[PDB]
Design a protein around this ligand. Structure first.
Ligand SMILES: CC/C=C/[C@@H](OC(N)=O)[C@@H](Cl)[C@H](O)CC(=O)[C@@H](O)[C@H](O)[C@H](C)/C(Cl)=C/C=C/C=C(C)/C=C/C=C/C(=O)O[C@@H]1C[C@@H](C(=O)O)CC[C@@H]1O
Ligand SMILES: CC/C=C/[C@@H](OC(N)=O)[C@@H](Cl)[C@H](O)CC(=O)[C@@H](O)[C@H](O)[C@H](C)/C(Cl)=C/C=C/C=C(C)/C=C/C=C/C(=O)O[C@@H]1C[C@@H](C(=O)O)CC[C@@H]1O
Ligand SMILES: CC/C=C/[C@@H](OC(N)=O)[C@@H](Cl)[C@H](O)CC(=O)[C@@H](O)[C@H](O)[C@H](C)/C(Cl)=C/C=C/C=C(C)/C=C/C=C/C(=O)O[C@@H]1C[C@@H](C(=O)O)CC[C@@H]1O
Ligand SMILES: Nc1nc2c(ncn2[C@@H]2O[C@H](COP(=O)(O)OP(=O)(O)NP(=O)(O)O)[C@@H](O)[C@H]2O)c(=O)[nH]1
Ligand SMILES: Nc1nc2c(ncn2[C@@H]2O[C@H](COP(=O)(O)OP(=O)(O)NP(=O)(O)O)[C@@H](O)[C@H]2O)c(=O)[nH]1
Ligand SMILES: Nc1nc2c(ncn2[C@@H]2O[C@H](COP(=O)(O)OP(=O)(O)NP(=O)(O)O)[C@@H](O)[C@H]2O)c(=O)[nH]1
Ligand SMILES: [Mg+2]
Ligand SMILES: [Mg+2]
Ligand SMILES: [Mg+2]
Lengths: 400, 400, 400
RNA sequence: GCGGAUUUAGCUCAGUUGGGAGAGCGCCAGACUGAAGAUCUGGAGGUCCUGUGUUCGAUCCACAGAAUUCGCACAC
RNA sequence: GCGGAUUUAGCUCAGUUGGGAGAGCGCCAGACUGAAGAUCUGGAGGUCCUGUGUUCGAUCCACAGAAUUCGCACAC
RNA sequence: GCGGAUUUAGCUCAGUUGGGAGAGCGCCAGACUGAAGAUCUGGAGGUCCUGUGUUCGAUCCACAGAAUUCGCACAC
């Protein structure tokens, strides 16, 4: 149901500091208007039996909403160390984010780690939201805990002292949107900190510009059997657009390029004609159950960039100084490689010249994924092995 | 069509002495009443073109009937040496039998061999029926030929002089039931010897007690494509009971456990609800032609005791003195093993202790059937190789 | 639509001398009557885009017609050296032919080669048609160019001076049948040379006698998907006859003997009951597209002479003197063998006696075709390797 | 459930009465060829389908199994 | 039925005019390791897809085949 | 998307704290047999599923992967 500017964002921060809560406080604060802005409550997201059981976001969750000017595609990341993988993924099919941060616990393990991941994953812009303020009173402490986030956002090459420290409270401002569902701006002093936070979004993040000029390509971000029909693959398409009924294909993880039909093309549960650039679309397909498509492949019309096992690439191994490894490695190294959606382990086989790649080193070499994948010379990709990120690089070529 | 006590029995004796004839003389003598007791004439049984052609029972045949008190499941065994296999089988899914014996030919090769088989196969009780009397007149000969059957039934550990020697004539008493179809007891002096014979059945054999408390299990005794539908597997179930329409399985001879439906559950050609314990039932199945089930497997609902190739067992090798072998044997010995229904050759592999099993020896060891089978620790089984029985034993364990 | 005597013939001669033209001049000259004799124009035959593009007959073409007495099955052969293969084929499912020869170019490469092929392929009778006369005027040249064809037809063991030299013009006599469609004999002096040519056919070729007393056997000469139905296999059957609806089989080239149905049995596009002996029939089949039958096999009812890879044979290797090879050869020799329809390479393996077959030599030995084929002891066959014919021989036996 | 077959060297076929099997085609050598193919002379290879019995000893006989093949029947 | 390709070492690719082909990746050695992986130095391997012709001699040329690939047509 | 398993010699199973694993069943030897089978005494074989980290050193520990298995959920 076409209309406004669909930008991509999200919340990423330590565990239990607020990512998940300050989310409804968007599907309410800016929902207190537009019939578009719907009912995205807390326990709403954390649908998972376990999630709500443990009390933490494990599984990635995304709940849209629109200010006035721009429409948004805001994703909610988990904070537990155990689940960065998921977290990572998200921050990949987005651009620019809200650094959820406890104003009562200062920075923390994930605080860093996440920003760092951001830094690593290259993310565009960030804006703090010094939250849980209400728990904090002593001012010498509220200032004192902004001087550390600037400090930190610096350390990880970032606007540091240039960034917005929208001190606020995700809960109080959400206990309001609950009482008075349609409270508007300039009404609640808590539903105000929120706006300042958006007046920083619209204010910090510039644009979600792209291009739908090159074929079907859906970085399959998700899959489910939606009762009564076939199955849908949610996932912010990079470059394509899908008018239901398009003979398609899945290019990746699965053996051969599976073909089916887009006879199902929703979007935010609100059917669209043919989703476009960066729009987190969501289509069904005729003849491809879940058993026919998993997070990872690239739903791509017959003929879009092919699947590969081998290939070549220009890589930059981060120094330990950048969270990379501290010991070089040589051929036989099998670190999983990340390609937008999924991640697959590949067996590095250094060039017939180099002998031992080292931290800091910037090099070239071959790879041989344990599975198949959508490759294209220039297709920049990331590398992480046991515990952390090691180096970034591009697909300099292809071999099979 | 439920009602009386279904006991299991049969006729076993030399070839041409009478087993097959003194059979109708039951489906008549006690048929001269109850509408249940039907038309089971001679040539009726020997349906086989060849059987009636050669003049001998080759193929196993069973024709029910009921006295007054108990109902019976009486089976007719062949006598020719060439066909003991069949004979054996029968005497397995029965209990207690009528030793058909010519009163004009004394005991004979099969006389012994069969009793012995009985003895070997462990059979409960036996009652002679010194037959063809009419051919015999001289009394010093009728007594004289009872003193040898006691003598013999002794030799093969049996009630010997305790057993019933119901001297009689299977033909004359069957030429009556032919003339006067409904002649009753105390009428024909030949149709009387018959009763004395039953008044010895009811009198000798005690009970056919059992239990239907453990799953589907049909020792598939027979198979045929019954015009217009699918196919039926006759075979006195040991422990189960089948209400038509039960999703089932065949566990044995065939590769994998074939699944189908009991949409066909006759019994004596007289449909029953759900046949039970030791009742020689007879059910059809949806999706399993003859080409899907052969004498041997165990029609057993999904989950009953599994199929095995390997396994362990406690065995008693009979001494030569007991009709067993006279030379020991060692590993590499491939004697077929008998499991209720069918019989399969297995490659004995003695324990890593014993070197040469000997007659008389009672031992333990491994086996490895040439095919698959329904095993269960405690599942007692028999062994016979070329020509005779060698030893009996139980499935002490299982291996695969 | 049964009626007259179906004899088999054709035109074979150098390239561009006339084979293709003096063809319509039959579907016209003798068509100027009988409604049977239809519209077979020049460019009609050469339907092929390329054929008419290059200006030469590459592809074999056959266009029927009937004099008065006998009906004919006349085939048009290509002349270009590049396409003898095709040419050859034709002259196989025919008998007796018209040596098309330019009266303005004397004999030529193919002139010889073709006659020779004829001679080689054993062909029965031949009649010249010294054509393009109109281009020629000087008589000392028209005689002079008949004295060379007799000369030649001699050289290649033939009636030589006994044969008909029906001097004529295929074009002029075809420019008439165009103007006056129903011009009759004794009318056009050019449409007369034609008759003389037929009055030489009927006059030279004696009979197309045969026998339909042995099973289905269609030397599959052609295949096409005929819009709306299944597919048809044209091809002068040797011995069979096919009433539509016959369960059939294809015995050759294809892996296993494919079975289908003759639910389609045309003939000259004029349905017949059940085509017969030597009649270039044409039947469809239920369940065998083109993808199920190619030029070569033998459509032969279930059970006709089997497929073979190995086999034995009595062979006569032609001397160089006969256009055969000039160097002997030994085991390992893989010359393609010709069997009526298709031709397949086979690996000769000389007998455990001979060491080196030589030109002139007449021998015996084994073969092992690269594919499967319809064999029968006595099934005479020809041999040609790179460029030419080498020797003829029969299937003395079979091996697999 | 019953009857006839046939089971042998990697392949196709032989052969026999118990002292334990032979051909071609491969196969690998040596000769010849730069090499290949062809050829010549050699060589290796078989639990003689399996068990048990009998025998001093079983490819063989007896008794029992098995695979593949042509047939006979039967709640048939 | 007709035309273009491409056929090479176990894998992926080279290479050339007739005297008979070279790389990586395997592969196996030797060094180093308790061993592995990594590495270093060696080694083996190709009937140059097949036949025939021509030649003293064919990976190569000629004539004929074959597999896989992109196209052309046709009772089409 | 989340959790429990289990991964070891050709096969079936052991075993442990970091100095690097043991049984049967095969497997091949030698004895015995003409040979077979049986038996006796020997022998060979495992990257301890994979990478990296830590360590002097990894089957083992840590961090990351993988296959197979039992469960939990979800435009579910
Ligand atoms: C899903 C597939 C997606 C792939 C792409 O993703 C995208 N974009 O989707 C990849 Cl291909 C990106 O396109 C690549 C990209 O964007 C590039 O631009 C790179 O990102 C860029 C070249 C890098 Cl790699 C920058 C790294 C900067 C690191 C810094 C400043 C480190 C922080 C140091 C502070 C600190 O104190 O850290 C502590 C201590 C430390 C120690 O002890 O030294 C250890 C670590 C600790 O945290
Ligand atoms: C279908 C599968 C069914 C299996 C079961 O079956 C069932 N039950 O269904 C089996 Cl598992 C049974 O459950 C086992 C069972 O029941 C046990 O109780 C055994 O049966 C029991 C331990 C045995 Cl084995 C007793 C044997 C007795 C033998 C005697 C008394 C021998 C006779 C001697 C006389 C004679 O002179 O014979 C001559 C001469 C002789 C020579 O020369 O010495 C040779 C032979 C001649 O005939
Ligand atoms: C499609 C399968 C069909 C197979 C059959 O097909 C059928 N029938 O369908 C085959 Cl199985 C036939 O049934 C076989 C058959 O019929 C037999 O009867 C043979 O045909 C017969 C035994 C032969 Cl082989 C005769 C050959 C005669 C050759 C001659 C007289 C040669 C001419 C010489 C003149 C000359 O100067 O030639 C020059 C010079 C020369 C040189 O230099 O020496 C070289 C060549 C030049 O042209
Ligand atoms: N005092 C105070 N408590 C808050 C505020 N925001 C959230 N909380 C409390 O913290 C709880 C859990 O925080 P939540 O938003 O789910 O954390 P998260 O970012 O999803 N972390 P993770 O998913 O990784 O466990 C809330 O339910 C609420 O009680 C706030 O602004 N002030
Ligand atoms: N005199 C006389 N003959 C009899 C008697 N019973 C049977 N017979 C004869 O013996 C014939 C065959 O006997 P039958 O019962 O078939 O023998 P069986 O027990 O089936 N033996 P098998 O089947 O092994 O051949 C009968 O048809 C009949 O003529 C009897 O009591 N007296
Ligand atoms: N002067 C003259 N020209 C003729 C005559 N017959 C044919 N032609 C010419 O030659 C042309 C081509 O001859 P055609 O019959 O197709 O030759 P073909 O026998 O099919 N040879 P190929 O098919 O092998 O090329 C005709 O179109 C026509 O112009 C004739 O009798 N006289
Ligand atoms: Mg969260
Ligand atoms: Mg009988
Ligand atoms: Mg032509």
């Amino acid at each position: 149901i076409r209309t406004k500017p669909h930008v991509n964002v999200g919340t990423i921060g330590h565990v239990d500091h607020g990512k998940t809560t300050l989310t409804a406080a968007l599907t309410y604060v800016a929902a207190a208007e537009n019939p578009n802005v719907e009912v995205k409550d807390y326990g709403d997201i954390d649908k998972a039996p376990e999630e709500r059981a443990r009390g933490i976001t494990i599984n990635t969750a995304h709940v849209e909403y629109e200010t006035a000017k721009r429409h948004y595609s805001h994703v909610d990341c988990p904070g537990h160390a155990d689940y960065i993988k998921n977290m990572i993924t998200g921050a990949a099919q987005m651009d620019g984010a809200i650094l959820v941060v406890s104003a009562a616990d200062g920075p923390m393990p994930q605080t860093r780690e996440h920003i760092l991941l951001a830094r690593q994953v290259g993310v565009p812009y960030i804006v703090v939201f010094m939250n849980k303020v209400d728990m904090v009173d002593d001012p010498e402490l509220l200032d004192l805990v902004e001087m550390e986030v600037r400090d930190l956002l610096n350390q990880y090459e970032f606007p540091g002292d240039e960034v917005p420290v929208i001190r606020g409270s995700a809960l109080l401002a959400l206990e309001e949107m609950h009482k008075n569902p349609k409270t508007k701006r300039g009404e609640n002093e808590w539903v105000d900190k929120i706006w300042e936070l958006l007046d920083a979004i619209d204010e910090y993040i510039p644009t979600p510009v792209r291009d739908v000029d090159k074929p079907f390509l859906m970085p399959v971000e998700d899959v489910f059997t939606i009762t009564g029909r076939g199955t849908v693959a949610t996932g912010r398409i990079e470059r394509g657009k899908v008018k239901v009924g398009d003979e398609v294909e899945i290019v990746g993880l699965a053996p051969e390029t599976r073909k089916t039909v887009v006879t199902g093309v929703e979007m935010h549960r609100k059917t669209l004609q043919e989703g476009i650039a960066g729009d987190n679309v969501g289509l069904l397909l005729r003849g491809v159950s879940r058993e026919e498509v998993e997070r990872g492949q690239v739903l791509a019309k017959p003929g879009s960039i092919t699947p590969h096992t081998k290939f070549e690439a220009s890589v930059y191994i981060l120094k330990k100084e950048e969270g990379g490894r501290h010991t070089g490695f040589f051929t036989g190294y099998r670190p999983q490689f990340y390609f937008r959606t999924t991640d697959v382990t590949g067996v590095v086989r250094l060039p017939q010249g180099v002998e031992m790649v080292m931290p800091g080193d910037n090099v070239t070499f071959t790879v041989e994924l344990i599975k198949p994948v959508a490759l294209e010379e220039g297709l920049r990709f990331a590398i992480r092995e046991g515990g952390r990120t090691v180096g970034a690089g591009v697909v300099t070529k292809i071999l099979e």
